[PDB]
Design an enzyme around this catalytic site. Structure first.
Site, mmCIF file in Angstrom:
data_model
loop_
_atom_site.group_PDB
_atom_site.id
_atom_site.type_symbol
_atom_site.label_atom_id
_atom_site.label_comp_id
_atom_site.label_asym_id
_atom_site.label_seq_id
_atom_site.Cartn_x
_atom_site.Cartn_y
_atom_site.Cartn_z
ATOM 1 N N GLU A 86 30.817 138.074 31.333
ATOM 2 C CA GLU A 86 31.749 139.142 31.649
ATOM 3 C C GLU A 86 31.028 140.236 32.428
ATOM 4 O O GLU A 86 29.922 140.641 32.077
ATOM 5 C CB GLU A 86 32.370 139.718 30.377
ATOM 6 C CG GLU A 86 33.183 140.977 30.609
ATOM 7 C CD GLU A 86 33.705 141.575 29.324
ATOM 8 O OE1 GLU A 86 33.317 141.087 28.243
ATOM 9 O OE2 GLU A 86 34.503 142.532 29.398
ATOM 10 N N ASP A 131 17.431 144.124 17.173
ATOM 11 C CA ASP A 131 17.405 145.517 17.615
ATOM 12 C C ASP A 131 18.409 145.759 18.734
ATOM 13 O O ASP A 131 18.574 144.924 19.627
ATOM 14 C CB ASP A 131 15.996 145.921 18.064
ATOM 15 C CG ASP A 131 15.460 145.044 19.175
ATOM 16 O OD1 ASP A 131 15.951 143.907 19.331
ATOM 17 O OD2 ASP A 131 14.537 145.486 19.885
#
Length: 257
Positions: A86, A131
């Protein structure tokens, strides 16, 4: 998805990654604008991150959420491996932070809300994130925040965004995500991560100690939320529902839970 590189017109380079480049691209048959990520197989095998990449693609494929960047499909050359993604027209949160120095409370709370929604959705699918970095956060056409890195996990570099348990080699769970929120919520409001240092070693110690201070302009609500998120003990960290229902969030966030 397509089967070959000739199915796409390659546009401007959106960015260069360590393993390979990302381009703006258009699927010819449908004129479909998307992002095309190119990776070199040799590079992937050099670090042996090939299997990790495959698993992460597999995990990403099953994720459907407005605040999570979509993977349309993939193929390979060889040597090259191509990911069809996307396209987020408004770039990264990182660059936005670089442009605005720091975010106001409303924007911050909104981004935190979207993040918590996406991560709550992921936790429902038993998906845990590594993270979370601002460079790995994109913005959609309406400015909606999107998690773009494929750092997911199904089984229960710079250290700035890692939780203490991951840097200490201790066992980590979903609570990691909440820690990340903390850091991001800090950075958004301050302009820099709370444990930033000129040295890897220093950053390590500051994270392990949870050693950070607030600038004076940080409000009591923000300080409260961040302090609850940045717990050394993962268990003492709140849940995503408690985060979405936090007074400061609900007071400043534009987007509902």
């Amino acid at each position: 998805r397509q089967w070959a590189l000739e199915d796409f017109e390659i546009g401007r380079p959106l960015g260069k990654g360590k393993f390979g480049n990302v381009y703006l691209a258009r699927e010819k048959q449908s004129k479909f604008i998307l992002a095309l990520k190119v990776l070199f197989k040799a590079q992937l095998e050099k670090a042996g991150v090939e299997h990790q990449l495959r698993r992460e693609v597999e995990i990403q494929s099953h994720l459907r959420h407005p605040n999570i960047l979509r993977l349309y499909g993939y193929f390979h050359d060889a040597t090259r491996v191509y990911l069809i993604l996307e396209y987020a027209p408004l770039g990264t949160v990182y660059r936005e932070l670089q442009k605005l120095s720091k975010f106001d409370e409303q924007r911050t709370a909104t981004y935190i809300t979207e993040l918590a929604n996406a991560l709550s959705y992921c936790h429902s699918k038993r998906v845990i994130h590594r993270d979370i970095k601002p460079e790995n956060l994109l913005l959609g056409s309406a400015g909606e925040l999107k998690i773009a890195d494929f750092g997911w996990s199904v089984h229960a570099g710079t250290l700035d965004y890692l939780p203490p348990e991951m840097i200490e080699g201790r066992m980590h769970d979903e609570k990691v995500d909440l820690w990340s929120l903390g850091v991001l919520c800090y950075e958004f409001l301050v302009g820099k991560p709370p444990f930033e240092a000129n040295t890897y070693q220093e950053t390590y110690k500051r994270i392990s100690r949870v050693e950070f201070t607030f600038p004076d302009f940080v409000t009591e609500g923000a300080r409260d939320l961040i302090s609850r998120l940045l717990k050394h003990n993962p268990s003492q960290r709140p849940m995503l529902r408690e985060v979405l229902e936090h007074p400061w969030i609900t007071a400043n966030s534009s987007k509902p839970s």
